Amino acid sequence: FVSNSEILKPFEKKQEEEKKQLEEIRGNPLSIGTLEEIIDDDHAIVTSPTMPDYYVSILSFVDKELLEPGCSVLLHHKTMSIVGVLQDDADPMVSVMKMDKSPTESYSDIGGLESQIQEIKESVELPLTHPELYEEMGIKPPKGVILYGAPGTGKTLLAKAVANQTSATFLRIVGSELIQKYLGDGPRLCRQIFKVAGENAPSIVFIDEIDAIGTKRYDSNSGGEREIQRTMLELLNQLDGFDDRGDVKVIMATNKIETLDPALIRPGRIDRKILFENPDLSTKKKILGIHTSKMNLSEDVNLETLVTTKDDLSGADIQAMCTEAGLLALRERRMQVTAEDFKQAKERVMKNKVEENLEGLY
Template identity: 65%
Template sequence: MGQGTPGGLNRQGFPGDRKQDGSDKKEKKFEPAAPPARVGRKQRKQKGPEAAARLPTVTPHTKCKLRLLKLERVKDYLLMEEEFVANQERLKPQEEKAEEDRSKVDDLRGSPMSVGNLEELIDENHAIVSSSVGPEYYVGILSFVDKDQLEPGCAILMHNKVIYSLGQYFGFEARIFWFGHLGFRIISGSGSGYFRYGLLTFYGQNELVQVLSVVGLLQDEVDPMVSVMKVEKAPLESYADIGGLDAQIQEIKEAVELPLTHPELYEDIGIKPPKGVILYGEPGTGKTLLAKAVANSTSATFLRVVGSELIQKYLGDGPKLVRELFRVADDLSPSIVFIDEIDAVGTKRYDAHSGGEREIQRTMLELLNQLDGFDSRGDVKVILATNRIESLDPALLRPGRIDRKIEFPLPDIKTRRRIFQIHTSRMTLADDVNLEEFVMTKDEFSGADIKAICTEAGLLALRERRMKVTHADFKKAKEKVMFKKKEGVPEGLYM
């Protein structure tokens, strides 16, 4: 009998196939492979009720976002325009009323209006005023005048209305008192009747009376003579157009230009910059030309005035013009005030025998006060120029007012050569021109004389219909200029 094999082993003694119990996993069945993906044209979506109810796909695309922002901006603009139109419609009645009120104020002011000065404020509705000619008046201030800006000394506008009044009842003296007290000016008289002013009634002869009242205020009053002194356009001359004068250019830069551009340098070294300089020397040596170069090189406001312009006809107008000049310079600071021919007002003081001489001395005293008075000048520099420094008053030249005196001598050989090169640089010269002959001459040439020689030589060439200037033209021009110079200047004038 054969014995059975142990469990789990087959007949050869190896583990054999044994039926798995229920806990074992079943064997995997065969599954066919997935069909290949469809390649080619995309199958069309079938239309139907489901496709109609489905919402379109919305993606956050860049173009859509930009379009949305653009439409929102357009909407904001439209809203702004709508608000603007609504505001204009709402403000239109107010503008019409303001225009009507403005016309009423203009009618009250009248035309023309007189210009006067406010001497004293009595109260909110009354003041004492004066005009350029005539006495002072006690007048009323109309309600539409801005009283916060009224201060003694300011320029005001007064209306110029003429009415009929009566004042014979009080007699001539009383009439003058009452009408002067009420701000009236009597012009003429004719007829009879009565006149009422407030609660007062006057009976008697008709008088033509001018009523004065403050109706306005002049803002930023600037004398027209001072406004034309301001150099609006910088001159074309620069330091490169000046032949020689290197020492003079250096001195004026240190005294005028550098304190305005780099004031911290003077603070660091512990000194106060100079207040002004004076340029003196013979005519034609380049004083005014150097002042033009300063105006060209700096961005400061440049005010130029001739000394004779400060001499005015009426009493007190000269000192007033000097005060106005420095006030405008202070308002426009940093600024430079250039006074040419200062010897017109700055001569030495003697016993004056006429009103004109005394007025010139008062103008110079005001100039002395403005140069070194109680108030500081700040960033205002002064340049004076004269041909006769020996005739100026010593008080004008003392340190503290004029700290530097810059002399302009006649040009030497090196300076002459440089000036000839500057003035002949744009001229068409012939080959025979030898400028060294004129540079080395013993005649005393100024810079203006050299310029006149070059100009005269060009005119002589044009007279002969030539486009080039020859050496002979320069010789003739030199003789002509030197002859006029020796003939026109008295001997011993410039010592």
């Protein structure tokens, strides 16, 4: 505090003189650009982001061993020579990426999905904490899981939850959106996903909804589109190129597996098939139990009464029920939520979802 300042000011000053002397030699101002390729005759061809290419000589701040293809770099204006190195965190390297490093969601917050919880735990969490069971027996681990169901309630929740538990970077890419309408650019985009992963592990790679670029057809003539299949293949070949015991676990989302290649399953990688169901009585009890904690409510309301009229529903319906119920209580201007309020709300959403109907009792 006082101790830092006394030292700090004379210490700062020597640094600045040196720092000024550095600054003069290297110049300013500069264009930022990207390395096209790195050449060991101390040259470089560079891709300038204004477009053109210039075969340039390195100015020594770094060597070509302290440089990698596709690093971001400081360029002058002379012919665009390499003045200095810069980080790639800032300059784009993404497709569609939500990064959520250690997400808010957790198993505790989405109630009892307990049976589903147990599967995802042995495949995704267990290798990262404990390579050792896999190593001792001498078996390979699942490095992928597939989550089937609908998102927000099944697929999304389990995948957010688990990442938070393992303290890994959750990356959601939307598969379809790459579904770009020009030949050739899906394959670039797949490359950037895998590039970021290897740089920034541990990670969970979530590919949402691979069924627009996930196609694999039977043709490429007669209304066949060649890009769609190309992208699907680039994606597959990198995936099979990556293998880990606890650097990357891959979570997929999709709802058809017969649009996917049997080598994108790759039996001996994706062992696990985790699927959402509608929960049990006990787990439903837990989902209710958490959500009522947060309410102020009557004591005529029970978890038990609410269970019996339920026919097995998703956790999302239970959440939806709570928001609808409070809204009739707030409309009656009061903060007590009766057994009748939650019951009116439940009936109503169930009714809106169950638009198709079929007599099953006969």
